[PDB]
Amino acid sequence: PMIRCLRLKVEGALEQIFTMAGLNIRDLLRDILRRWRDENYLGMVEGAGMFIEEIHPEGFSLYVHLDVRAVSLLEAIVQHLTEAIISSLAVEFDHATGGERVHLIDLHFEVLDNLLE
Amino acid sequence: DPMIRCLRLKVEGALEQIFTMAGLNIRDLLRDILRRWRDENYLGMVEGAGMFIEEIHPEGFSLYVHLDVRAVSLLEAIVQHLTEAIISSLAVEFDHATGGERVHLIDLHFEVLDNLLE
């Protein structure tokens, strides 16, 4: 396998913004990723998992486990995943608030080291 | 079908400092223990795995191992193997580096993060 992990930080204040709009951003991310996993499985990624680790006093780290079909595909994989997350959160937020905006375009993944390479 | 998990092992800052004072780099030792497991073909337990380290502030770090553990009983077997392998190997390294001193390692354990996409 060719295994990578991505990490994205969700600010505690971002999570609260979503909460106040009546949204659970963790549940939304899970839905976005499930959908993205299903819409790519057997394609560029043979497997995908999602882990959440608390940040204290608030916020969380979102980890995405990926088994990629080839290393050179990572850039396009990360690009498409990032776009799906930002666009999908933006749509939900718009709908929950009657058209308010929230700053999301800084959401971005780091490709973590894989020391078992 | 896959059972993707993340195993997280916390290393206290004081434990890291204990190894540093023995002239040992515990992060590199842990890296090498996991690479030897890999180089044994993971003893067949998994087809592959990823590994990274995150800092703890102000001191210490967590080691992360993420892989398809296949099944619950196999997960338990992987965790038991890695934990024993880490504890025994670090103890040998520490013993050698210090001329036979001991260090308390039996609290080292992995917590398991669930795949939230399941």
Swiss-Prot record, chain B:
Record GO terms (molecular function): identical protein binding
Write one Pfam family the protein is assigned to.
Adeno_E4_ORF3
Q: Give yes or no: UniProt keyword Methyltransferase.
A: no
For the keyword Cytoplasm, the answer is no
Query: Which segments does the entry list as coiled coil?
Result: none
UniProt keyword terms in alphabetical order:
Early protein
Q: What is this protein called?
A: Probable early E4 11 kDa protein
- Please name the source species: Human adenovirus C serotype 5 (HAdV-5)
